[PDB]
Design brief:
part of a larger assembly; 3 chains; A alpha+beta (about 1050); B alpha+beta (about 210); C mainly alpha (about 425); A: about 1050 residues; alpha+beta; 5-stranded mixed β-sheet; about 30% helix; B: about 210 residues; two-stranded antiparallel sheet; 4 helices; about 10% strand; Outer capsid protein lambda-2 (chain B); nucleotide-binding (chain A)
């Protein structure tokens, strides 16, 4: 139901927000409270004593993390962000969510969807962070802590927290804690605002530059956003001119001449984009016109709203009254021809249907009811025949059926058969087959375009017929339309900005109505009337035909010339102007076919279009040579009413061209269609390119194709899975940009792994003609790629572990991180007593109290211990057995297994260091529940830290990673002269060199460096006024 | 442009102007449909022929050249067209080439159609040139000075050397009689049955001759 | 105006081939197939108040430089005496169009084929290939960036503004159009112009010609600081008070205090710098962008052959036999002269210019060091790279860290009122 709607309007867009809080999406999670308070420690070491907020609370574990929507206000949220949990908790279900085809587990999944899942994570955090920043407050400081600055103030409530927190700068106290000498690194001269804008007295800034606890990514993203947006702004003058030249030089809007401060309005884009979007519209409409009927009606409406046309039967009536006589004859041809009139009730409309058909011509043909036809031969003894036939004669130059005068002549042919006939060498069809039955010029004989093939007395009639036609069949011309910088162009069958017409245009000579009677239509009906005259001058139509009937039919056709309908010049001159002016007001730009007058040699035949290819051919020339999109449809209509319309001209006597248009257009110039269309379809094509780029991270293609993260388990699969991913994205999107269209249809149709947009047509002699687009820019792609590469080094920063692990007897007394490397006990595939494994399996037997063993791929004989290298995937064969074989043999048996997963999420488990025990339970569990698709996030058993030293204690642990990833740890135990126990971490130099380093520029980029979280931003003090408040709309 | 964009450069008093044709073509001159574009072209061709007939150190035309070469339209039909052929011949006769059959003052309608019949055939051009809307060439030293006055659409290949001697005629007419000729041999050889098989598609045999008197 | 259109293909100071590697294209062709990457090129500025930086491309210096290297490689194929399109690799490169558009990986057969050889200094005409030679419009369109390449290519040094001052640039429609952008950042209207010609370059003597003339002219005046709050050009002048840094935002202003007069006499000149630090600046790139259109709509003067390297002389499209030799400088002494004659006017104090110079030349130092360091790194790369070759930017020399030769040029470009 939304299809014509998609040709009617768009959903409400969202382009501007105003961040009434914070932009960056990160807070620290301090989760594990410290061992405090210790006793000989005086309470003098903390701030909860004299109560001013610390920028960071103290905790035994504290790490920076992303969190969306915890510090910011908006009048509008932006569609379902992503946040995670500490490494002590599991969000993993994501991975058992939205794509898995089989699941049962709470801890474990198919390694397949993995890359896809983190992909989704990426793109959704791409999604959420697009808000727009309203420049933020200020207020002069009053305690000499600061430089008395204008602190960035929140005009909303409860801002003192951030002051305390964003500014350990603002912090200062005699004490030596981590934070103390940490912040000692900062200076005081580069705080808060960097700069601003100011002019136009009685105002705030026009833009500002200030320092904020802030990332770089969202900054970069939304700035890119802002910029691409800004690529489309306008200034009054051109909008004024749009009005004007489209106002027919009559109605006014005036441009400002006063000082311009700032008036933002990003709308206008390049032409190719709207071209191709509407092109896709044209794609996904194949083979139905029930959609077209509404707009046809609407056209007739809006044109009826603008025309001084009146329809009148009375002319017909008084005219046909043309006889005075004594009555004994056989017939009254008066009432006969009247049979077409039916001497009002109730003619209202439907003259303009095929006329519109001219204006969207490129797609449909116009015809009339075969029911209107007398399908019954003819005889001059029946002038009903000639009446109807002439009705048809009228209709024909108003008909777009590609056989119009063909069928005209064909009537005649069907009539005088055996009295008069034409040349022919084919009986595929003969002269005795009717209309709606003869289409191609290759159905039209040589004689059909060769008047020489008959003697002009053997059949003078048809000879003069073809001759007349060749000399007089109506002549076409053309005209321009609209303004390109406000409307663009959809004309592709023709040089840009042209608009043909089956008719020749004739300008008028004065602003009044014009009394015009030399029209090729005037002359045209005159032609066919005299043709009838000459016809009936036959010697043979008077062995019983009367002088009375003679003068009757003479004066018949004569007064048929004597008609004074006011439509001919009407449509010949200024109705074209009605067309030109509706064109913009008309939604859904057109496509019309180029025309012939007599040509039968350049008619187009077919249309062929691709959205994708199946072969190694990429050159669109040879590519579309088999891909295709052809639709073709008739529209049957009336000949009676339309002929009448030709035959019924009556207009108001006070009608005058100029003033009528002047008044009429004026109300009729509120139009907002195009802007909404631009927004929607811009977003549309961007979705195209973004989506296919996503795909590109899954598949291979003749397209330039590369991927970098593939080491994450995921592989190609069916088109089913493909479109699965695809529509998941689409739904995320329609959420994100908040509209409710139908979209991606061509992409949700066949093979999306490859695309091609070539659009062509075939002619009377092949000679096809085609077009393909080049895309505009697409920042979101750049963004998401950059992010993929960000996380290409910041995985663990999100609980994401690369590398692998090793299960082994870890029995010692020294305290050191399982995520640290062994002081002395590293193991891999290069040690003695290491073994890698094929499917070699032969278990020995310990009965006979003998030496039990297992057979190596070597072929040796092996007990259960050593340094071994195994594909856990094999463990998942009959893991029941597997576990049963080695549970104890690893428990206190001393085998060592370097083992592979590649990548995963993990799990944390803290505990008192001041005691000892074993970690065998989750050992057993996390082992046993392996399936080919069950894999709990890797557990980890680490004690908890302190401030000082102790005597040591026993320790028994099992497994270690392969690579370092403890970056995620941000810091621990702030209010401390140091963290002694465990390791110690510190607020990384990698985060605030803005002030710690005095030599950094105002801007700097940490790529792929561990990024900052305090950053300078330019907050936008722009204002984007509405499109009507500036423009003075005046008659 | 697809309705025919042709121009004669050499200045009329008409002045700067271009031209398009309409959607009509001549049925007459059996057996040809005739799109007036190429028709008026043929007329220009006749002009150039008439030109090439004589050669006098004062042939007081005002313009040797009046024909029209494609200003626009080269984007709908290739070089194998009859029309491209015509324009070739246009610039050729512009050089000064001329038919190798006696030429009527007015060359019959059917003369024209027969001409068409001929040229339309298979074969090649004698003239390598292929002109351009990018530019139209100036011959080696063809005796005409229209180049000597204009640039607009004109670039000579100074490299050009493909020329001929000079020759024309003072009388061209007809005779009925099958008249004499004498052979003047050459040097090389050939193969016999092969010449037989050659003539096997050329003979006038078989026919009854006028036996005449013995 | 101009119906003749040519270009040239880059040479090398010692490379046997193209230094372009597919990686570059890919990370650019991540989207689309365009030969010009105008959109994110321009948007890659990061608003220009700061730059965008990567290992692959730290500067739009690097960005456009490899853009050039790429397109130099690209043009190789279709453009020959034997013109053509399709099925011959240039590092697996294939177009998909007779208009020579689209860019994807070579077909399997074409993956195996040898790539088309290249040659240096390959000047050609932009009018030979027939297809586009039928569409004037896309031809013009491409030409405005063929020029952007060419001009920077023609010299062993950087870009050049062809500044021009002429009166008729005052007209009613003109100051009208002017009025549209008061209190406006140069960069944004530059964007607007990129738009308003990327759609369609305006016609030869377009209103917008005189406009952009005003734009670049007033720009460079403020740049040297020619005009100011009192010395005003029909009372208009940009600003950016944050001077002393690698980012400026010069913005329209009107001064109701004193106005300076334009004597009759049309003038113009051609400016380059001599410090390869411009990679932080953008304004040069936009000036290039627009001057390309100025050429593609208006036939413009040419420079002396001696003004350019001998091998690159006598070019119909660019190298005439006369025309004002270039104008070079360095931003360091540029802002020096700038602030100095400004205080000469007595609208300052000394310590003002002094504290300017301090931070300015500090930044100069740091970023030159970074430049040279990245140079060293790239060298070591080449040493490790026998086959995957490249230059991030146009290779340079320390010999380019001295005189601006700008001395008399000060008064010269100053006497253009």
């Amino acid at each position: 139901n939304k299809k014509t709607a998609q040709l009617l309007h768009a959903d409400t867009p969202r382009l501007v927000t105003w961040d009434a809080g914070l932009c960056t999406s990160f807070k620290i999670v301090p989760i594990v409270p410290a061992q405090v308070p210790q006793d000989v420690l005086a309470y003098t070491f903390f701030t909860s004593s004299y109560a001013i907020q610390s920028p960071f609370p103290e905790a035994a574990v504290s790490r920076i993390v992303v969190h969306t929507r915890w510090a910011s206000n908006v009048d509008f949220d932006r569609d379902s962000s992503v946040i995670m949990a500490p490494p002590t908790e599991n969000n993993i279900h994501l991975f058992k969510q939205l794509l898995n085809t089989e699941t049962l587990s709470v801890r474990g999944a198919n390694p397949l969807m993995f890359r896809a899942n983190v992909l989704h994570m990426l793109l959704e955090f791409v999604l959420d962070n697009l808000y727009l920043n309203r420049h933020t407050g200020f207020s002069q400081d009053h305690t000499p802590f600061t430089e008395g600055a204008n602190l960035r103030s929140l005009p909303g409530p409860d801002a003192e927290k951030w002051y305390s927190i964003m500014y350990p700068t603002r912090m200062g106290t005699p004490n030596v804690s981590k934070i103390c000498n940490f912040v000692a690194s900062c200076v005081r001269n580069r705080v808060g605002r960097f700069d601003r804008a100011q002019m136009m007295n009685g105002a705030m800034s026009e833009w500002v530059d200030v320092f904020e606890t802030s990332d770089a990514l969202t900054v970069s993203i939304r700035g890119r956003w802002m910029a691409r947006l800004a690529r489309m702004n306008i200034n009054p003058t051109e909008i004024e001119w749009a009005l004007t030249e489209c106002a027919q030089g009559y109605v006014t809007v005036t441009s400002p001449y006063a000082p311009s401060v700032n008036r933002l309005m990003p709308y206008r884009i390049s032409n190719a984009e709207r071209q191709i979007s509407q092109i896709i519209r044209i794609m996904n409409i194949g083979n139905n016109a029930t959609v077209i009927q509404p707009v046809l009606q609407d056209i007739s409406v809006l044109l009826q709203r603008i025309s001084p046309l009146q329809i009148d039967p009375t002319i017909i009536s008084n005219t046909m009254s043309t006889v005075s006589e004594s009555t004994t004859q056989t017939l009254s041809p008066a009432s006969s021809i009247l049979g077409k009139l039916r001497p009002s009730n109730s003619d209202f409309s439907s003259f303009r249907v095929a006329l519109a058909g001219w204006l969207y011509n490129g797609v449909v043909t116009t015809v009339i009811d075969d029911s209107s036809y007398p399908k019954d031969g003819g005889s001059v003894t029946s002038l009903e025949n000639l009446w109807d036939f002439f009705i048809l004669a009228l209709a024909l130059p108003l008909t777009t059926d590609p056989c119009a005068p063909v069928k005209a002549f064909m009537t005649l042919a069907n009539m005088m058969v055996g009295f008069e006939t034409i040349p022919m060498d084919n009986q595929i069809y003969t002269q005795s087959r009717r209309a709606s039955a003869f289409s191609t010029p290759h159905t039209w004989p040589r004689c059909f375009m060769n008047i020489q093939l008959i003697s002009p007395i053997d059949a003078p009639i048809l000879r003069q017929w073809a001759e007349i036609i060749h000399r007089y069949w109506p002549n076409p011309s053309q005209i321009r339309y609209g303004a390109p910088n406000v409307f663009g162009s959809a004309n592709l069958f023709t040089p840009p900005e042209v608009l043909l017409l089956p008719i020749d245009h004739q300008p008028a000579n004065v602003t009044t109505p014009t009394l015009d009677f030399t029209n090729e239509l005037t002359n045209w009906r005159a032609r066919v009337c005299e043709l009838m005259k000459n016809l009936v001058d036959n010697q043979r139509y008077q062995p019983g035909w009367t002088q009375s009937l003679v003068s009757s039919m003479r004066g018949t056709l004569d007064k048929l010339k004597l008609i004074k309908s006011m439509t001919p010049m009407y449509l010949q001159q200024l109705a074209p102007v009605e067309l030109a002016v509706i064109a913009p007001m008309l939604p859904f730009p057109p496509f019309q076919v180029p025309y012939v007058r007599l040509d039968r040699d350049r008619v187009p035949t077919m249309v062929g279009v691709t959205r994708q290819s199946r072969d190694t051919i990429t050159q669109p020339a040879l590519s579309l040579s088999t891909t295709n999109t052809t639709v073709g449809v008739p529209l049957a209509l009336d000949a009676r009413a339309i002929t009448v319309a030709l035959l019924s001209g009556k207009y108001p006597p006070d009608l005058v061209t100029n003033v009528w248009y002047a008044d009429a257009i004026y109300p009729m110039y509120a139009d907002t269609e195009v802007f909404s269309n631009l927004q929607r379809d811009m977003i549309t094509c961007e979705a195209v390119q973004t989506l296919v780029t996503l795909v590109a991270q899954i598949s291979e293609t003749q397209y330039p194709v590369d991927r970098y993260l593939d080491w994450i388990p995921s592989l190609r699969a069916s088109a089913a899975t493909a479109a699965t991913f695809a529509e998941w994205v689409n739904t995320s999107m329609k959420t994100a940009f908040d509209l409710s269209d139908m979209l991606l249809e061509p992409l949700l149709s066949g093979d999306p792994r490859m695309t091609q947009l070539a659009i062509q047509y075939q002619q009377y002699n092949g000679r096809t003609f085609n077009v393909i687009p080049e895309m505009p820019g697409s920042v979101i792609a750049d963004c998401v790629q950059l992010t993929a590469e960000v996380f290409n080094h910041e995985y663990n920063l999100f609980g994401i572990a690369r590398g692998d692990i090793i299960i082994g007897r870890v029995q010692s007394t020294h305290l050191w991180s399982p995520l640290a490397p062994p002081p002395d006990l590293v193991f891999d595939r290069d040690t003695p007593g290491v073994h890698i494994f094929g499917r070699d399996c032969r278990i020995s037997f310990g009965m006979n109290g003998a030496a039990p063993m297992i057979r190596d791929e070597t072929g040796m004989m092996v007990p259960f211990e050593g340094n071994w290298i195994f594909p856990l995937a094999l463990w998942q064969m009959n893991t029941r057995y597997f576990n049963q074989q080695f549970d104890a043999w690893i428990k206190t048996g001393e085998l060592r297994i370097r083992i592979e997963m590649g990548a995963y999420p993990y799990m944390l488990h803290y505990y008192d260091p001041r005691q000892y025990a074993n970690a065998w339970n989750l050992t057993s569990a996390w082992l046993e529940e392996i399936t080919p698709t069950s894999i709990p996030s890797v557990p980890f058993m680490v004690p908890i830290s302190s401030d000082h030293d102790i005597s040591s204690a026993p320790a028994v642990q099992y497994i270690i990673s392969t690579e370092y990833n403890d970056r995620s740890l941000f810091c621990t135990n702030s209010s401390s002269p140091q963290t002694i126990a465990g390791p110690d971490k510190h607020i990384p130099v990698e985060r605030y060199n803005i002030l710690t380093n005095p030599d950094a520029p105002p801007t700097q980029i940490q790529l792929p460096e561990v990024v900052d979280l305090y950053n300078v931003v330019t907050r936008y003090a722009y204002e984007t006024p509405p499109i009507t408040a500036v423009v003075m709309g005046v008659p | 442009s697809s309705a025919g964009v042709l121009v004669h450069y050499d200045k009329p008093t008409n002045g700067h102007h271009y031209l398009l044709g309409t959607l009509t073509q001549m049925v007459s001159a059996p057996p040809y449909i005739i799109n007036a574009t190429d028709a008026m072209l043929l007329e220009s061709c006749l002009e150039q022929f008439s030109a090439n007939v004589r050669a006098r150190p004062a042939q007081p035309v005002t313009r040797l050249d009046q024909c029209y070469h494609l200003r626009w339209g080269a984007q709908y039909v290739g070089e194998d067209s009859l029309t491209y052929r015509l324009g070739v011949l246009s610039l050729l006769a512009t050089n000064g080439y001329q038919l190798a059959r006696p030429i009527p003052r007015q060359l019959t309608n059917r003369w024209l159609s027969s001409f068409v019949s001929q040229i339309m055939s298979d074969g090649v051009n004698e003239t390598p040139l292929w002109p351009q809307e990018r530019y139209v060439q100036i011959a080696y030293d063809s005796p005409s000075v229209v180049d000597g006055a204009t640039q607009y659409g004109y670039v000579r290949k100074n490299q050009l050397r493909l020329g001929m001697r000079i020759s024309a005629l003072q009388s061209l007419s007809d005779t009925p009689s099958p008249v004499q000729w004498l052979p003047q041999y050459t040097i090389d050889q050939a193969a016999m049955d092969e010449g037989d098989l050659m003539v096997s598609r050329l003979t006038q045999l078989p026919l009854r001759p006028d036996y005449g008197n013995i | 105006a101009r119906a003749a259109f040519l270009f040239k293909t880059v040479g090398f100071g010692g490379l046997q081939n193209v230094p372009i590697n597919d990686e570059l294209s890919s990370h650019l062709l991540r989207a689309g197939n365009s030969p010009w990457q105008l959109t994110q090129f321009l948007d890659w500025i990061s608003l220009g108040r700061g730059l965008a930086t990567s290992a692959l491309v730290p500067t739009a210096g690097s960005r456009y430089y490899q853009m050039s290297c790429l397109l130099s490689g690209t043009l190789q194929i279709p453009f020959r005496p034997n013109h053509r399109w399709g099925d011959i690799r240039f590092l697996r490169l294939v177009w998909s169009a007779p208009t020579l558009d689209g860019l994807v990986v070579a077909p399997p057969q074409v993956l195996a084929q040898p790539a088309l050889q290249a040659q240096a200094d390959r000047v050609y005409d932009c009018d030979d290939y027939p297809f586009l030679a039928r569409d004037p419009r896309f031809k013009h369109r491409v030409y405005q960036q063929l020029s952007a390449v060419t001009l920077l290519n023609l010299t062993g040094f950087g870009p050049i503004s062809y500044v021009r001052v002429d009166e008729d640039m005052w007209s009613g429609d003109v100051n009208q159009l002017l009025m549209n952008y008061f209190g406006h950042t140069f960069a944004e209207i530059a964007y607007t112009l990129c738009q308003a010609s990327a759609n369609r370059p305006w016609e030869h003597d377009g209103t917008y010609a005189r406009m952009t003339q005003i734009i670049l002219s007033l720009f460079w005046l403020s740049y040297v600081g020619v005009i100011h709050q009192q010395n005003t050009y029909r009372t208009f002048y940009f600003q950016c008070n944050r001077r002393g840094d690698a980012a400026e935002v010069w913005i329209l202003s009107c001064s109701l205090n004193h106005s300076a007069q334009i004597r009759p006499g049309n003038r113009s000149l051609f400016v380059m710098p001599t410090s390869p630090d411009w990679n932080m600046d953008v304004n040069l790139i936009l000036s290039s962008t627009l001057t390309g259109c100025l050429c593609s709509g208006s036939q413009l003067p040419l420079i002396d052959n001696n003004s350019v390297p001998a091998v690159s002389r006598n070019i119909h499209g660019w190298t005439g036999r006369a025309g004002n030799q270039l104008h070079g400088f360095q931003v360091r002494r540029m802002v020096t002269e700038f602030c100095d004659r400004l205080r000469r006017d007595g609208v300052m104090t000394q310590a003002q210019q002094n504290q300017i110079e301090a931070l300015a030349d500090q930044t100069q130092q740091f970023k030159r060091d970074k430049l040279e360091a990245w140079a060293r790194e790239d060298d070591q790369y080449n040493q490790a790279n026998p086959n995957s070759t490249m230059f991030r930017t146009k290779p340079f020399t320390n010999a380019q860290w001295g005189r601006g030769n700008t001395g008399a040029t000060s008064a010269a470009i100053a006497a253009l009122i």
